[PDB]
Every structure is written in C-alpha cells, then in structure tokens.
Design a protein around this ligand. Structure first.
Ligand SMILES: [Zn+2]
Lengths: 36, 94, 146, 177, 156, 39
RNA sequence: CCUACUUCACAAAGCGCCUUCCCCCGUAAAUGAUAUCAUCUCAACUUAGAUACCCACACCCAAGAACAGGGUU
C-alpha cells in the first residue's frame, strides 16, 4: 500500500530506498509492506 | 583614376609572363607558385588561395574559384606591388 | 591492509601500509581533506583523490577508518558514485551511453514525459547539490538543475 | 589588400568547411558552436541577408555524452498527423534508433526560426563515426577545439602523475577492505 | 597554503606574468622610435583617420565623401581642418589618442562640396478608433565634405 | 527533367529546392534591372 | 475474394468463402558497499529484462467522374 509517511510497525520491519522511492519491507509480517 | 585600380585601365593577357620578365630585369630569378590555402575543392564553390614565391619568400598571393585563376590573381598582385600601386598607394598631392 | 587466505585452512596476511604523505601544509586539521586544503577544491573529475577512500571493488570506506569529517565524507562518496557512473574507475568493479555528473542511478529515473509550464517547470538534475560551495570561480554559480 | 574586385569579394565570402569531433561531449554544447557557424555569426561580415554561413562537419555522434540523467530523463516528443499519433521517446531510445538525430535536433533548435534554417541545416554534415566521406574530408579546413575537456580515467593517468599526488591518510595495518 | 593537483586546485585559466616595468618602458620607447623613423622615411602608404564630427565617429581617408546632416555655415570650396582625430592608422602602424590625438601629430583636411536638403521625410501619427491622424513632412539640411588630406608628422 | 535537375542542383550547391523553382511575372517586373552600384 | 449457396447473372454483393505475424516495466530475486553482519543497487552491479508490401493518333479494359493507369501480337 502507498503512504506519504512511512512508519515501521514492527522490529523486523526495515526501510529501504529502491527505484527512487522509500519502501518498508518486513520478512515476518508482509502486511507492513509500504510505498512512498 | 581615383577608385580605378590598374588592370581596369591597362588591361592585359598572360600576366605570368610579364611578371617573369620583370623578375628577370630585377633579381635574375624565376617565381615558384605554391598553394597557400583552400576551402572546398569538390564542393563547386572553392576558395583557392595561391601564392608566388621567389627564393622561399612570397612576393604576392591571390584568391580564386579555380587554381589557374588564383595563380593569375597572385601574378596580378605581384605586378601591382612591383609597379608602386596596390590599394594602399599614396593619396597624391593636390 | 590485511587479507583472508583460504584453501580446510584459513589464514590472515598483511601487505603494504600507505604510511600517509610526508608533511601536510595545514597540520592540526581533523581530516585527510581538511589538513591539505581541499575543503571546496575537489570533484568527480579528480580520480587520484577519490580512489584513496575506495575499496578494491568500488565501494566506499567508512568514516572511522578514513577519518573524514562527516559532511566531507558524504561529498566524497557522491563524487565516487559520479566517477563510477562516468566510467572513471574501471579497475574497481564487482568482479552503451556515455555519461557524467549523474546524481541519480540511471535505472530509477522515469522520463520527464510532461515538463510543466515555465513558471513551475520540471528540471533534469545535473550534478550533486552537496558540491555547491565548491569554488564556482566563474562569475555565475553552478547550474545544478537543467 | 591589392587584389582585383571580384576575386577579393569571393575571398571575403566563400563557404569554409569546419570539423567537430564528438566523443564524450555534450550535444548542444556542440550545437551552440555549430549553430553559430551555420549562421555565419562567427564572421565580422555577418548579416541575415548576405548568406555567409559555413559548413559544419560533426563526427562520432554515437559517442555523445549527456550531463546528469538526461539519457533516461530527456523526452523528445513529436506528433504524427493522426489521432493517437503522439510519440514521446527517451533520448537514449532516440539515439539507438538514429545516432545522428540528437545533435541534429539540438542544432535545429539553436538556429533562428526563419526560412534560412533549413538551408543552414543542409550545410550541416553529421556522422555517427570516424568514417567521413572522401569529398567532405578534402573540403575540410581546421577543427575548432572541443568544448568539454574530457576528465581522464585512472588507467590513462600514468605513474608519474600518481607519484606527484599525495596519499592523504594512514589506515590501520589490520584492515582488510 | 598548498593544494595538490586537481580540477579546482589551480585556475582553469593560465597564469600570465606581466613583464618588468623598466624593461617594458624601454621596449615601448624603442617601438615609438621605430614608428618615428618610419614616419620620417615616408615608409607608409595612405593613412586613415577615425575623426569626430557632429557627434558621430567616421573612418575617413583622402578622396572620400562624408555627409553630415546639418548646416556648417561654410561657403562651398572652403577648406577645413578637422580636430578630434581619435584614431589615425595605416599599414604597419596605428596611433590612438587618450582619447584625442594632439594637433601637432596629425591633421585632417576637408573641402565642403555641397550644402543641400534631405529628401522629404514623413512623420505621421496614428491611433486606433480615436480620430488621431497627423502628418508632417520634413527636410533635414545636409552638407557634403570631401576629405582631401591626412597629414601626419614626426612628433612622438 | 525538372525535379531531378532541381535535386542535382541542390546536391551541387547545398541548398533547399525552393529557390530553384522559378518565380512569377509580377515579381520579375518588380525587380530592379539597373540598381545603384557603388565602389 | 466469389468455387458452391443466396441476392443475382457477360458483373456487383452477403446471408457465403478466404487471411490475420512483437514487447510492455509493477515488482520478484543473487553478490555487495556507504554501515567490514545485513540490504534488489535514485551505491558501483547480475538476473527475470522489424519485417513485409512499394519502387524500370486511335480502340478495348477486371482502370476510371474528368484526369490518370493497364492492354492492343
Ligand atoms: Zn575537515
């Protein structure tokens, strides 16, 4: 899902910058995947 | 004869020969005819800029559409130089 | 610089310390750049400098090993990146269009398909905005956006 | 000067052929010069009515470089006549299709919008490579020097230069890289 | 205060080292002397002058015509010495003043050929939708000078 | 032959076709046959 | 395009028959720096990632408004 303000929900989540945008990826809880 | 340069007034044919004669009279020598510059040539609007050297020193140099023409021009220039003319001349006292 | 040597067996081997340059012009500065006097006098152009803070496969070195002030470090990194993009560090690699001054990675930039009206127009970024205070020298400043 | 009139006049005018090597240069930095040459603004004889423009040969246009991310970002955008015929192309794509194009377009934009523009364009000669034709080579007079200086990669710098440059810091003797 | 060789260490431009003022002065003097010698010898051939007449600057030579748009209040055939020769040049050397050259150095002479009126020049005002329409014909008076001679002297 | 000739001319001289196409009667009438020549 | 069918009938149609040939861009995933672990990399990188057509008087015509085009053995 797309979000202007990205926030980590869990400790397993991590911010990465890819393709000129910030993403949120979590291997445990793939729900918390977010876009800029 | 204010604007009118030589060759308009005293028109001639084959200036090269004349130059040669003059050279002989002066220095006892003959001129080589080197080619200084050329844009075009194959274009159909060339600018052959051709000199005239006497003992590795150019006495004159002239332009042309063709090489022969350029040479002729150079010769004419040389002649002018010899005969105290050019475009420079001196104004003449009145 | 040390190195791991494996054949099972594993060993460590050290080879050739750079040992600095003899005597800096401004000593008592806090950094490699700072002491010499290259605070605003380097670029991606100059690769003899960039290669000094670079790994054998083209990546940067950390601030704590180099000993560079943080603001400078970032700039250096940027320069290195630019150089890489250009093709100025060919012997530093992981294992056709010519380029220079690329701030973004070639992949990851979508085309300016609708540059707006001149009063709010989209501009193609040329060079880094870190290297502003770099000596402009000519009476105009650096045009960072094209 | 000396000279007879007509020949002098010819000398004064006469279209000179110029050369430009691309290779690592920015188009439009080429085109500025090229456009100027085309117009004949480099001559102190210049007028729009006189037709004093010179010939510009440009070579190696496949080896153009773009500053920043323009290869990916810069869009060349044209319409056919036909509905749904709006074609937008990234510079790189354009280059791939036709390497002469990018420089040419830049040159065109530089030139004044008057009717002479197309005539000026016909005195422009663009080549993607070192291979120029023979007639054109014969014609050529002078290469005006390249705008962009070329930065020079580490392979080319040589040992002496390296020696001259100082090594700015000491690492720990125990650091791998 | 040292910086190793980079793109922004030294200037893009080359460093010029202007020469010693005594030597330079000597050189200048020598040059002047040469010029003087040339002048003496009559080694030149035709001069030109950028003269200042009627707020305009004119490159002028012996035998040429100049058209000045006003009355000079001179009878025709009268001879004039034009002052303000701010450039005087020839093949092989030129002389410029700061801004005007001195009267001893150079002088330009001019004969007034004819005094005339200009062709009728039409002034004409107009404005849209507002019945404003003027028309004035004018003939600005003119004089034709023929520059006769540029004398140049050995004063240098 | 016309078009071909024009093309040839263009090739020779490096210029567009438009000038070689022959202009009309009115224009030619307008042209000054004895212009004021100088120098 | 017309061999049947049907409308028709020295043809022209459909209701009849025949032919129809590429990608697509969000992401997913290795090695790997800044930040000696990790990380898909607006770090340097590696993966999934245009041909065909077209081009040398007269009379008749599957060519055609005229003009043009094809044929005239
Ligand atoms: Zn510092």
């Amino acid at each position: 899902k797309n979000k202007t303000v990205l926030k980590k929900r869990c400790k397993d989540c991590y911010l990465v910058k890819r393709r000129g945008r910030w993403y949120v990826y979590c291997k445990t809880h793939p729900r918390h995947k977010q876009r800029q | 004869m204010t604007g009118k340069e030589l060759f308009e007034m005293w028109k001639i044919i084959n200036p090269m020969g004349l130059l040669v004669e003059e050279l002989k009279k002066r220095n006892v020598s003959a001129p080589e005819s080197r080619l200084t510059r050329q844009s075009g040539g194959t274009t159909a609007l060339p600018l052959y800029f051709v000199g005239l050297y006497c003992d590795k020193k150019l006495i004159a140099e002239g332009p042309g559409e063709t090489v022969l023409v350029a040479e002729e021009e150079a010769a004419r220039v040389a002649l002018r130089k010899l005969y105290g003319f050019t475009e420079n001349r001196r104004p003449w006292n009145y | 610089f040390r190195e791991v040597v494996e054949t099972t067996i594993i060993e460590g081997r050290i080879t050739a310390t750079p040992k600095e340059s003899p005597n800096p012009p401004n000593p008592s500065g806090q950094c490699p750049i700072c002491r010499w006097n290259l605070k605003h006098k380097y670029n991606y152009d100059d690769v003899l400098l960039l290669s000094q803070f670079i790994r054998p496969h083209g990546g940067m070195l950390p601030r704590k090993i180099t000993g560079l002030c943080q603001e400078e470090h970032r700039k250096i990194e940027e320069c290195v990146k630019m150089a890489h993009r250009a093709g100025l560090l060919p012997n530093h690699r992981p294992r056709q269009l010519n380029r220079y001054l690329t701030r973004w990675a070639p992949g990851s930039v979508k085309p300016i398909y609708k540059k707006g009206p001149r009063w709010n127009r989209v501009r193609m970024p040329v060079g880094s905005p870190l290297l502003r205070d770099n000596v402009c020298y000519s009476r105009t400043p650096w045009k960072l956006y094209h | 000067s000396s000279f007879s009139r007509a020949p002098q006049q010819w000398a004064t005018f006469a279209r000179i052929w110029y050369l430009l090597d691309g290779k690592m240069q920015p188009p439009g930095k080429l085109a500025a010069m090229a456009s100027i040459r085309l117009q004949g603004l480099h001559k102190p004889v210049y007028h729009a009515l006189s037709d004093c423009g010179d010939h510009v040969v440009i070579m190696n246009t496949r080896h153009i470089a773009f500053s920043g991310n323009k290869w990916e970002q810069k869009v060349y955008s044209s319409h056919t006549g036909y509905p749904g015929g709006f074609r937008q192309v990234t510079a790189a794509q354009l280059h791939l299709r036709d390497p002469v194009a990018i420089v040419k377009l830049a040159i065109y934009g530089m030139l004044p919008k008057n009717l002479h523009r197309r005539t000026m364009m016909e005195r422009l000669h663009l080549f993607p490579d070192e291979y120029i034709p023979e007639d054109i080579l014969k014609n050529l007079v002078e290469e005006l020097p390249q705008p962009r200086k070329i930065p020079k990669r580490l392979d080319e710098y040589t040992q002496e230069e390296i020696d001259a440059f100082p090594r700015l810091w000491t690492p720990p003797e125990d650091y791998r890289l | 205060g040292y910086v190793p060789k980079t793109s922004l260490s030294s200037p893009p431009w080359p460093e010029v080292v202007l020469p010693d003022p005594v030597e330079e002065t000597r050189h200048h003097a020598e040059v002047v002397k040469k010029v003087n010698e040339m002048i003496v010898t009559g080694q030149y051939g035709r001069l030109f002058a950028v003269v200042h007449f009627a707020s305009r600057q004119w490159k002028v030579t012996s035998e040429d015509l100049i058209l000045i748009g006003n009355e000079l209040d001179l009878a025709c055939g009268e001879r004039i010495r034009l002052e303000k020769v701010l450039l005087v040049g020839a093949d092989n050397f030129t002389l410029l003043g700061k801004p005007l050259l001195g009267k001893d150095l150079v002088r330009v002479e001019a004969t007034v050929i004819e005094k005339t009126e200009s062709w009728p020049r039409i002034i004409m005002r107009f404005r849209k939708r507002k019945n404003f329409k003027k028309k004035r014909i004018v003939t600005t008076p003119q004089t034709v000078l023929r520059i006769n001679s540029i004398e140049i002297a050995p004063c240098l | 032959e016309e078009g071909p000739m024009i093309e040839q001319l263009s090739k020779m001289f490096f210029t567009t076709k438009h000038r070689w196409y022959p202009h009309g009667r009115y224009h030619r009438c307008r042209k000054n046959l004895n212009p004021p020549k100088d120098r």
